[PDB]
Amino acid sequence: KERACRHCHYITTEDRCPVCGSRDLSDDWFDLVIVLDVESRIAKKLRESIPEAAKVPGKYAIRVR
Amino acid sequence: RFVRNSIRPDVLSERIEHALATGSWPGGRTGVSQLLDRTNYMSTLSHLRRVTSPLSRDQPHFEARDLHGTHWGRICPTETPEGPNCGLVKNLALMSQI
Amino acid sequence: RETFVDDILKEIREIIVQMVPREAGITDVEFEGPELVIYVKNPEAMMKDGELIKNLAKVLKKRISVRPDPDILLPPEKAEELIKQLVPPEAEITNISFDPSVGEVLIEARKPGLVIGKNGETLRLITQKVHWAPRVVRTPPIQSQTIYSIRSILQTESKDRRKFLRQVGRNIYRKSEYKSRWIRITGLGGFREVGRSALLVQTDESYVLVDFGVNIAALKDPTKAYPHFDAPEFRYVLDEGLLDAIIITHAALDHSGMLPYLFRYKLFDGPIYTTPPTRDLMTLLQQDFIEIQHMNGVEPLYRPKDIKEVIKHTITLDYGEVRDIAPDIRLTLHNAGHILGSSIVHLHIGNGLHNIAITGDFKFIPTRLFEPAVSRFPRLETLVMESTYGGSNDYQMPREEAEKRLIEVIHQTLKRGGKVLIPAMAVGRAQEIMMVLEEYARVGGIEVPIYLDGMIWEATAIHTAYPEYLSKHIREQIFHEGYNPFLNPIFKSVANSRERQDIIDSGEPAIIIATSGMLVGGPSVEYFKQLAPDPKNSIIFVSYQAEGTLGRQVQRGLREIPIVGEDGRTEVINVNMEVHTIDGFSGAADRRELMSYVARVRPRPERIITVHGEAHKCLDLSSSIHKKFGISTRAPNNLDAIRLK
């Protein structure tokens, strides 16, 4: 199963969080966002919404529940 | 093992079987394969020596339905069906060779 | 909520492996509803005798269900052959079913006593030689459609049933023996009123709903037809899904009418604890109610799939069987004597903290059908009693002269060649009338056939399917002797309208027992229409006739009744037949019966709650009990909560 972090909204397959090292990950999330370039327009839009998102390219989630 | 396990013979077998059973060849052709006539000894040989034309049966193909002079020794001049198949469904002559 | 079912299961497994010898080979231990299931690889060592199983059940205080491991399972054909060879030929086995998922074989036999054994040793022998846990049910002498359908539904949905049972067992044993801080009783319906009964038992840990029913008299008004869904406690229980279980006292629309409505809107997902006769009769009654509502043109309350879901969520309990339905509540059922499968609900909350007995509809005098209600309990503190006949002047006539008058009226009618038409309920008084008629005809008094039309045949078949729930006389006749009173050749069933027309047109005398006491539907109306002009015939009323019904019009003495004909014109029915009324066959307890039950109950309850009756009747009964015995009595209204402890 794939779970998303509650802090940086990063989806990872292991317990450790490779972005902020948070131990609270949520198994329920929607609207998967894939970031390949940091300077992307949608990455910039997500940055002003969630400050911790789009710091490192990879999978991301819009909301955590 | 990786290559062998990725091959499904069922698709090819079913495609060939369906085409040979229904008679509908790929490309829109129909009637390619028909059930063998087993009424008597003559019907089976006639069906095995049958030649058909791709032209439509409803259209009058006056130039194509009539017996041609080049059919001597290749197409039987008398054995033709009655109706829309007259002149379009032919039979091989006894001396004909392909 | 937090649960400790895993720790309890681990402790139980440790106790088992401490007590059970190692050669048994215990593999898995789990909970299936209110009983414990143990899987072993060597059933021979586990159950060489019943003493080990009895000791395990006594120590664990659970119902032990030993099943073989699924890996060691005989082929179904070899298993069937071995079961047939082991069972004596006297027990006629009809159907044998197997469950591949869990070790269990269902055996349908005409004589389940021989299959079970004198002390259960035959079941152990079968499950040892065949490695299949046996479950024995009775094949009725008369085929029943409802029971066959229920068994087929249960067999075809084995996976869902097993999942539901496992979930129920996990929810029941979420924690060990817990002492409740307080016990609360609230009545969502049936308090100071008749119909739409609903009783909620609330503790600090578990919630229990008792006889969730519907009202038919006030069906036009939604505020009185259904129990109070606006109660804050009931809303909190339903919204959070905290309802542990639902128990139905007996199969009647005022006690089980609203049950499929909860499953229609997915408001409930737990188990239902009724006796098998109660389950079958309530399914039949709910189906009939849905069909009637559909035929009347109104919107049906629920759907047959909801009744199927009710069947799939029903756990069957026998009389005197103690089962754990909650972490702090223990439930047992005792005979009530009202109808077939009628049970008095006894709740044992805590480890001796409190005891509640909800009698519901019951009878305390011996009858031709069922034994009198059980008045002895291991412990009793609060008693909930019906007050249908709680008035001071309410005194039903005794049974013997009422049945003598019925017999003499029927004999007089048959002497002149007339026909006897007896409108009756689907269940209850009809079977008692058939038993009385069979007793009268067994000595050669009457030879005319007795015709049952409508649901009478189905109810009779359901009654035959469960002879152990009947009275001691019928039980002795069926078991000790080879004579079945219900299997008399005089009882005939009419299949279609052609048979009914032949019966009506026949000049030979006959007795017809229809299925509509008020002549408001069914074959009763047709029989009355086709037999009214004949002066030799007679009609006997054995139940109260409500105002506005045809039966009340005939009973009052109307010689002619205008009705709508088939062509749309008014038709006149000339009632030249004799009219008789014998209301001595009511299954409800009399006021004298209620007083005798209060006086003779053991132990004496601390308080008595009077429900299920009119407000003045309930108040009169409570005042009479308080003045005669000194016990504190209350007659609360709806939405009233009483803190018992």
């Binding site: 929607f30 966002v33 894939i34 390949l36 992307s40 327009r41 949608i42 997500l46 | - | 339903l238 809107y265």
Partner: protein, 147 residues
């Protein structure tokens, strides 16, 4: 760059997006970002400088059908990136349809709305008696808006 739409099989947008992302990572495709909202079914958004890059990225995948010949303005997909509760935007008194949950395919009337617990209380319109039920905000769909 520019937002482009890729038509994919309904209910399997996340897997197609993941395969496209993996292919772009492995083969160094000039793909900027990929957005696949859960509410949108059968369509995903890929940010690329030109549609040729999208066409080259989505080819070779059975589940990527075609790329829509057009460019989406950023204001159209701006609201998708913003995080808003599903309960928000609902007012009591209107009629909603429950897409998922135990009450699938049932119409209900909204009674109570609270954004703290992200839950909405509704009453079934087909029930003969009002029984309020608690359901998730994302499970319901607004049929009509009245009061």
């Amino acid at each position: 760059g520019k937002i482009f739409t890729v038509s994919v099989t309904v209910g399997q947008e996340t897997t197609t997006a993941n395969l496209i992302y993996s292919k772009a990572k492995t083969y160094n495709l000039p793909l900027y970002a990929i957005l696949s909202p859960s509410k949108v079914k059968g369509y995903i958004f890929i940010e690329a400088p030109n549609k040729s890059a999208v066409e080259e990225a989505i080819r070779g995948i059975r589940h990527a059908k075609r790329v829509l010949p057009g460019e989406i303005p950023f204001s159209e997909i701006e609201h998708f990136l913003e995080e808003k509760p599903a309960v928000s935007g609902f007012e009591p008194g209107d009629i909603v349809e429950l897409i998922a949950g135990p009450f699938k395919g049932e119409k209900a009337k909204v009674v109570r709305v609270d954004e703290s617990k992200d839950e909405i209380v509704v009453e079934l319109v087909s029930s003969v008696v009002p029984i309020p039920v608690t359901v998730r905000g994302e499970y319901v769909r607004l049929i009509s808006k009245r009061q």
